[PDB]
Amino acid sequence: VVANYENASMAADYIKRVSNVLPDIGIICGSGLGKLIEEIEERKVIPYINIPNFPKTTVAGHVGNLVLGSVGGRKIVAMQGRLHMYEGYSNQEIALPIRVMKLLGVRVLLITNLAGGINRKLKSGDFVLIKGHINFPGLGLNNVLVGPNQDEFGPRFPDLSNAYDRLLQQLALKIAQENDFQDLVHEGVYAFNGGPTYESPDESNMLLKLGCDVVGMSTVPEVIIACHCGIKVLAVSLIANNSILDAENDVSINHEKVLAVAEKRADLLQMWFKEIITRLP
Amino acid sequence: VVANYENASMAADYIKRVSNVLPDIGIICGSGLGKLIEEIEERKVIPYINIPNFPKTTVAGHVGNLVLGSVGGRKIVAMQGRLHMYEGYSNQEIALPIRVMKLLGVRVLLITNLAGGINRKLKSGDFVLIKGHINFPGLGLNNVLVGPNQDEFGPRFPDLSNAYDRLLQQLALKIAQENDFQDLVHEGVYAFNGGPTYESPDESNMLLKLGCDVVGMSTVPEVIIACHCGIKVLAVSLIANNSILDAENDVSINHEKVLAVAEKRADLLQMWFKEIITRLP
Amino acid sequence: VVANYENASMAADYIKRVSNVLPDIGIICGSGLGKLIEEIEERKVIPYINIPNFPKTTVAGHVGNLVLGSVGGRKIVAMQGRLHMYEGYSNQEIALPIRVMKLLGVRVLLITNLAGGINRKLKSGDFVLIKGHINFPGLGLNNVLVGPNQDEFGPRFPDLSNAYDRLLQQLALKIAQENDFQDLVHEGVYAFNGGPTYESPDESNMLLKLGCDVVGMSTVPEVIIACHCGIKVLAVSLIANNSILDAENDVSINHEKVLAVAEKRADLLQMWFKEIITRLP
Numbered sequence: 046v047v048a049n050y051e052n053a054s055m056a057a058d059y060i061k062r063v064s065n066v067l068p069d070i071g072i073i074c075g076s077g078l079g080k081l082i083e084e085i086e087e088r089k090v091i092p093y094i095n096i097p098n099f100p101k102t103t104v105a106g107h108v109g110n111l112v113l114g115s116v117g118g119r120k121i122v123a124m125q126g127r128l129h130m131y132e133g134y135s136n137q138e139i140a141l142p143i144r145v146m147k148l149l150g151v152r153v154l155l156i157t158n159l160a161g162g163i164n165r166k167l168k169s170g171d172f173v174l175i176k177g178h179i180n181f182p183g184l185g186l187n188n189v190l191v192g193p194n195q196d197e198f199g200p201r202f203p204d205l206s207n208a209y210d211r212l213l214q215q216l217a218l219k220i221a222q223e224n225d226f227q228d229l230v231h232e233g234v235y236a237f238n239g240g241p242t243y244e245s246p247d248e249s250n251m252l253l254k255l256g257c258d259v260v261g262m263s264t265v266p267e268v269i270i271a272c273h274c275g276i277k278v279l280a281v282s283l284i285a286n287n288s289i290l291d292a293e294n295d296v297s298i299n300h301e302k303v304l305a306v307a308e309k310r311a312d313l314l315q316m317w318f319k320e321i322i323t324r325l326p
Numbered sequence: 327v328v329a330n331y332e333n334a335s336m337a338a339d340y341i342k343r344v345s346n347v348l349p350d351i352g353i354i355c356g357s358g359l360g361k362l363i364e365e366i367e368e369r370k371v372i373p374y375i376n377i378p379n380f381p382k383t384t385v386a387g388h389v390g391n392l393v394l395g396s397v398g399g400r401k402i403v404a405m406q407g408r409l410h411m412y413e414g415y416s417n418q419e420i421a422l423p424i425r426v427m428k429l430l431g432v433r434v435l436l437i438t439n440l441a442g443g444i445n446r447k448l449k450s451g452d453f454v455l456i457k458g459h460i461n462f463p464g465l466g467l468n469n470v471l472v473g474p475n476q477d478e479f480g481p482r483f484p485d486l487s488n489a490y491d492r493l494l495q496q497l498a499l500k501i502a503q504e505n506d507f508q509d510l511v512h513e514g515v516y517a518f519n520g521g522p523t524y525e526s527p528d529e530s531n532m533l534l535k536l537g538c539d540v541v542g543m544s545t546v547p548e549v550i551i552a553c554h555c556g557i558k559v560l561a562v563s564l565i566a567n568n569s570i571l572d573a574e575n576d577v578s579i580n581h582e583k584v585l586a587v588a589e590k591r592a593d594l595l596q597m598w599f600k601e602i603i604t605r606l607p
Numbered sequence: 608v609v610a611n612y613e614n615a616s617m618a619a620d621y622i623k624r625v626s627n628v629l630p631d632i633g634i635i636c637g638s639g640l641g642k643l644i645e646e647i648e649e650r651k652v653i654p655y656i657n658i659p660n661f662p663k664t665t666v667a668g669h670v671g672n673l674v675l676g677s678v679g680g681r682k683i684v685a686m687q688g689r690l691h692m693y694e695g696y697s698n699q700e701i702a703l704p705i706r707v708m709k710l711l712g713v714r715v716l717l718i719t720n721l722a723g724g725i726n727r728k729l730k731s732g733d734f735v736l737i738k739g740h741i742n743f744p745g746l747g748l749n750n751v752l753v754g755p756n757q758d759e760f761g762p763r764f765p766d767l768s769n770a771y772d773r774l775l776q777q778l779a780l781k782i783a784q785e786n787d788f789q790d791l792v793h794e795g796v797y798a799f800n801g802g803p804t805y806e807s808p809d810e811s812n813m814l815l816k817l818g819c820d821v822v823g824m825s826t827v828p829e830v831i832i833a834c835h836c837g838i839k840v841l842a843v844s845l846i847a848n849n850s851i852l853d854a855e856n857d858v859s860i861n862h863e864k865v866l867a868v869a870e871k872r873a874d875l876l877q878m879w880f881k882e883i884i885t886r887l888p
């Protein structure tokens with residue numbers, strides 16, 4: 046199923062009939078960082094499997110719902126169970142949910158993820174406001190927009206120079222200062238590693254040479270689809286480890302360690318993004 | 327349809343029966359740089375859709391013709407409407423037209439493209455004679471030759487050390503001097519970005535670190551297929567902008583700007599390559 | 608055919624019924640480096656085409672056998688005719704033979720390959736004990752584990768920090784010293800170039816900047832599948848040329864030159880790995 050105008054409209058039609066919510070904000074939460082989705086008011090949960098033309102996710106398994114409702118008086122839509130390209134999903138499957146958000150009226154997309162630290166000033170538990178990216182799949186002919194262009198949504202050759210909105214990064218830093226945890230907030234460049242293997246020690250050393258501050262396996266595909274169709278983005282990474290230090294000390298990383306850091310910061314991140322939603326222009 | 331010996335011979339058979347032209351020179355022109363194709367004498371236009379085994383291009387749309395005729399007394403064949411891998415074409419679809427050129431007797435392939443400037447000595451409107459490349463898709467398992475080797479055309483493991491003929495670069499520079507625009511002519515290394523997104527600001531900073539002089543979304547796949555089957559190549563890039571300066575100044579690039587630069591240089595480039603064809607050994 | 612638990616068990620069942628050998632060591636030999644497979648005692652040769660669920664290799668052609676028997680008193684299994692991803696094989700086809708080795712009881716995998724030299728201290732004919740890698744396909748969304756995870760074999764997000772066993776590198780160096788050819792033995796980082804084109808001169812210059820010591824077109828996919836399911840690996844590269852020197856001198860490389868170096872070192876490498884097998888803990 047192609048992520049074209051007709052197929053996305055069919056999905057959005059079903060969603061409208063069921064929810065009666067017209068959102069202008071969208072949110073995609075990282076693994077272990079989805080608690081805010083349980084605080085949505087007057088909410089409506091829609092499993093992907095019931096939405097026309099939505100991708101099939103049974104092979105991967107686990108939760109997959111679209112959740113609509115109110116937060117801080119604002120109308121939002123959330124992806125509960127996000128799609129990763131290391132699972133084998135195609136460009137079309139990743140893009141369609143984002144283009145459905147567009148047809149529903151979304152103008153701002155907030156994203157969180159877990160990532161490894163490359164910059165030496167980064168430690169486990171820090172936050173990184175993403176200001177740019179290095180898209181290794183894109184350079185290597187696996188860009189999320191490879192294929193026919195869907196002209197109704199955006200141009201053939203999009204410019205990514207302003208994909209990470211400056212004002213939204215400023216508003217997020219301001220809230221960190223009002224609550225006195227700005228010491229945890231950095232900015233940096235995000236490198237996209239297709240995955241699913243964690244970056245090797247020598248791959249981490251390479252990324253340091255190339256000016257990368259963090260590395261992860263998500264986010265960039267959704268950012269490009271949102272920028273293509275004119276949606277503003279804020280993306281924040283939670284640092285689970287510093288891969289450069291681990292390589293120098295012969296220390297390992299694993300998913301169990303990643304999720305422990307997520308649990309330690311989940312509540313502060315929930316509080317942080319709830320206020321962001323409330324304060325959005 | 328595979329780009330094998332049998333399928334390419336079928337296409338070349340049709341072309342011979344229709345044109346009566348046996349060319350030894352081939353040309354692939356960049357976007358907005360195809361005016362010379364309208365100056366071909368005693369010409370014959372063949373739309374791709376009528377040639378057996380030629381790839382289907384209706385989804386992408388726009389012009390797609392093979393044009394044969396005479397220029398400067400030399401017999402040539404031109405691709406009017408070239409195939410880009412960011413459209414979703416397979417390795418086999420990109421390769422077959424080049425291997426048809428081979429069976430028709432082509433020994434020299436001239437190529438032009440539009441690209442972004444990485445080297446700080448490059449400005450909008452300059453020309454770059456390509457002397458080598460960095461093939462990011464090739465490193466990442468999307469090389470144009472991934473698949474079974476077609477032994478009739480070339481070896482399993484080709485050497486690209488002489489893919490960009492030295493003498494042809496010299497002849498092109500000589501003509502620039504005779505007409506006194508050598509101040510516009512550089513040489514440099516071409517980085518292949520799969521696309522279709524323009525290189526991001528931080529991707530441009532990375533390419534500077536790696537020794538790249540220009541970046542574009544084409545050319546390298548055709549060069550590799552031509553080098554595989556023993557065809558000499560000259561490739562020239564037209565610089566539409568300097569991506570490093572744009573990143574430092576927070577300036578954008580877009581297709582509308584690219585085509586404006588193409589229009590400003592199209593006539594000088596036509597004059598330039600017409601003489602090259604006439605002067606080829 | 609997916610490289611899942613059920614399909615791999617079917618293949619291993621056939622192999623058990625035919626050989627009566629239960630190996631705990633596996634070996635994959637590089638091109639021109641397979642002579643040791645002719646020295647296997649009480650051996651049993653099984654062509655891939657007869658083993659259920661094994662990948663089809665007729666298009667590529669050439670030898671493809673699984674060989675079981677005894678070496679130095681140890682029980683081994685060998686892949687005679689290895690699969691390269693530049694031929695067009697899928698992730699599933701590359702992985703299944705390795706996961707069959709696992710179900711047969713393999714705990715150690717020994718691998719040899721031919722590669723180009725990037726580090727300036729490397730010359731034609733040297734050996735390189737691989738201690739890490741840079742996986743360009745993996746960064747670019749062509750990792751061998753892209754797809755659904757086969758939970759019975761390993762985790763979703765494996766850590767590659769210890770994929771190249773330290774003790775095995777030490778044992779291999781020790782044997783080189785006992786026979787007084789340690790002057791040929793280096794250690795270094797292996798860059799994975801998808802291929803099948805040899806690295807271009809400017810790609811070699813890039814890899815030097817990035818800290819790569821050697822470059823080749825194999826090994827990394829098998830290493831990742833073995834590390835995923837808990838198999839220890841030793842990997843050794845034979846250097847056929849120094850790509851940096853060749854680029855500075857405008858010298859070419861080709862397969863004929865590669866195989867000549869392989870012939871010159873094949874007997875010493877056979878002797879070397881026979882003792883390694885005998886001395887494994």
Ligand SMILES: Nc1ncc(O)cn1
Binds near residue numbers: 159238261284303
């Ligand atoms: N901690 C971590 N490291 C790498 C990565 O891709 C995700 N998370």
Ligand SMILES: Nc1ncc(O)cn1
Binds near residue numbers: 443541565566579
């Ligand atoms: N001006 C420009 N920049 C990048 C590119 O790939 C093409 N053209």
Ligand SMILES: Nc1ncc(O)cn1
Binds near residue numbers: 724865
């Ligand atoms: N000699 C050589 N060089 C490169 C390569 O990929 C294999 N062998």
